[PDB]
């Protein structure tokens, strides 16, 4: 990833993966050594690097949830509080986008990271902990629809409203950067 280009977001459907830790900081999302790479590179393979691999040869950690067979095409991330705080790192959004995340549902986000996600084809969502724990118990095959016109999430575990600033809404719904 690289663009910083506004991609259209209206209604999106995908399956989910839960990783419910608080304070997944930009360093955990995309380690500092990878900031040496130019923005034409793919960052997907570096996403969550230290959780995801056992060594420096890309041997997958078979315990990391993203690697689990049922979750390898998940496009909607359910997490904890304060996702993406710490050193400002637009590359961390590129990693998430390049991997294939379109939506993230958290307790809260780092301020810059929130903007970086929105500027790189991800919709970051704030939900209360009660809903995020419901979403975390979805089946890997369960579809979830996010409808930005309605500001609603639909799932087998419930349907939920969310807030978003009207200006972000206008930019996402239209093709607009």
From Swiss-Prot:
Gene Ontology MF terms in the entry: 3-isopropylmalate dehydratase activity
Catalytic activity: (2R,3S)-3-isopropylmalate = (2S)-2-isopropylmalate
Keywords of this entry: Amino-acid biosynthesis, Branched-chain amino acid biosynthesis, Leucine biosynthesis, Lyase
CDD domains (alphabetical): IPMI_Swivel
Pathway in which this enzyme or protein is active: Amino-acid biosynthesis; L-leucine biosynthesis; L-leucine from 3-methyl-2-oxobutanoate: step 2/4
One GO cellular component, as annotated: 3-isopropylmalate dehydratase complex
UniProt cross-references to Pfam families, sorted A to Z: Aconitase_C (PF00694)
SUPFAM superfamilies membership: LeuD/IlvD-like
Gene3D superfamilies associated with the record: Aconitase, domain 4
Enzyme Commission designation: 4.2.1.33
InterPro entries: 3-IsopropMal_deHydase_ssu, Aconitase/3IPM_dehydase_swvl, AconitaseA/IPMdHydase_ssu_swvl, IPMI_Swivel, LeuD
GO BP annotation list: L-leucine biosynthetic process
PANTHER family named among the record's database cross-references: 3-ISOPROPYLMALATE DEHYDRATASE SMALL SUBUNIT, 3-ISOPROPYLMALATE DEHYDRATASE SMALL SUBUNIT 2-RELATED-RELATED
Subunit structure: Heterodimer of LeuC and LeuD.
Protein family (similarity comment): Belongs to the LeuD family. LeuD type 1 subfamily.
Protein's job: Catalyzes the isomerization between 2-isopropylmalate and 3-isopropylmalate, via the formation of 2-isopropylmaleate.
Name of the featured protein: 3-isopropylmalate dehydratase small subunit
Organism expressing this protein natively: Streptococcus mutans serotype c (strain ATCC 700610 / UA159)
Taxonomy of the source species: Bacteria, Bacillati, Bacillota, Bacilli, Lactobacillales
